[PDB]
């Protein structure tokens, strides 16, 4: 019932332009939990099953079976955006703490928050 | 000439729904410089002149005197998104390193990172 960091929602990302990821697809909540409770928006990262294995240090793999996907997929920590919460359709699952640690790490690389 | 972290571009964020920020407005590039050089997208954070003082730990102020702005503004590190580079029109300015340290900090607060 509350939006928590690490939750996997199905959400409507369209319309998009060019290389932006759109459609209705799984996304992961990456905003801190204070913003998730009180802000009118959430910050998410997109999941695509267009690749099933990672090719980039900012990519994180999600098992299809464990996290209720149709296909083995990957979190694109380079494809992130702020959504009005009305964009969140369905909450599918939520990531393990160890998967959120790989997500934290990939977000630091993608956003230039470490060294490098 | 290359897109750099800390560069402030004019970009088209439209169309949006509800509480998402849209329009054609300044943004600060927050993606790393390896990604800014080779990927077809950048990650930006939106700037508003609807407020001139910060009200949230994920807000960072920009002063009209230092940067090519229309008004004293504030960076909203909760309104961030990935944009295809064709969405970037003009390069306006770039932030100081000291101002970028405040950006990093609010980004760690905004995104639930502590390291």
């Amino acid at each position, epitope marked *: 019932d509350p939006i928590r960091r690490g939750d996997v929602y199905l959400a409507d990302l369209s319309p998009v332009q060019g290389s932006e990821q759109g459609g209705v697809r799984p996304v992961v909540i990456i905003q801190n939990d204070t913003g998730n409770k009180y802000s009118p928006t959430v910050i998410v990262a997109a999941i695509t099953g267009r690749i099933n*294995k990672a090719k*980039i*240090p900012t990519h994180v793999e999600i098992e299809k079976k464990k996290y209720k996907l149709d296909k083995d997929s990957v979190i694109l920590l380079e494809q992130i955006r702020t959504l009005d919460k009305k964009r969140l359709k369905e909450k599918l699952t939520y990531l393990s703490d160890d998967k959120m640690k790989e997500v934290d790490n990939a977000l630091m690389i993608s956003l230039g928050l470490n060294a490098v | 000439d290359p897109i750099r972290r800390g560069d402030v571009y004019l970009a088209d964020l439209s169309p949006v729904q509800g509480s998402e920020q849209g329009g054609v407005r300044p943004v600060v590039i927050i993606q790393n410089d390896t990604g800014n050089k080779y990927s077809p997208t950048v990650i930006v954070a939106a700037i508003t002149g609807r407020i001139n003082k910060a009200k949230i730990p994920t807000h960072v102020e920009i002063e009209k005197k230092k940067y090519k702005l229309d008004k004293d503004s504030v960076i909203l590190l909760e309104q961030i998104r990935t944009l295809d*580079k064709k969405r970037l029109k003009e390069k306006l300015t770039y932030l100081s390193d000291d101002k970028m340290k405040e950006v990093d900090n609010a980004l760690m607060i905004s995104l639930g990172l502590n390291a």
Partner: nanobody, 131 residues
Framework: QVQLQESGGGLVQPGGSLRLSCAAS????????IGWFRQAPGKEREGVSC????????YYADSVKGRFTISSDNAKNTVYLQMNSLKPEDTAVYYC????????????????????????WGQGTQVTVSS
């Protein structure tokens, strides 16, 4: 379906030069980055150069900077690698590869150790540098 046919290899003298070609077939040329890997007997497969479709941004491994040059002919769907000042340590099998992330991944491999699989691979062309 997707095929990368290379060529241009052969024996060269140290200090000599060559121009390799990579002809790309069954994909959208502007939606994929094409580049060059190399592997010498017994040793490791290293990425050499890469060129992204739109923006034309290039990558070069450190050991061939100033000496190699990658370029593309969007009409012929062909990538070129012009190798100058050839040294014998350049002697290897040169493969061109193609992937959506081939270029940003190779640039990242200068900062983070990784081991990522890329989609499409050529057959390889022998490049021997010897007196």
């Amino acid at each position: 379906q997707v095929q990368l046919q290379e060529s241009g290899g052969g024996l060269v003298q140290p200090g000599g030069s060559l121009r390799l070609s990579c002809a790309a077939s069954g994909f959208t040329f502007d939606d994929y980055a094409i580049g060059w890997f190399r592997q010498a007997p017994g040793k490791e497969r290293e990425g050499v150069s890469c060129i992204s479709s739109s923006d034309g941004s290039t990558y070069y491994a450190d050991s061939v900077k100033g000496r190699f040059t990658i370029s593309s002919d969007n009409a012929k769907n062909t990538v070129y690698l012009q190798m100058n000042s050839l040294k014998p340590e350049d002697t290897a099998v040169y493969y061109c590869a193609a992937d959506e992330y081939l270029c940003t991944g190779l640039a990242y491999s200068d900062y983070y150790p990784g081991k990522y699989e890329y989609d499409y691979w050529g057959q390889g062309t022998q490049v021997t540098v010897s007196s």
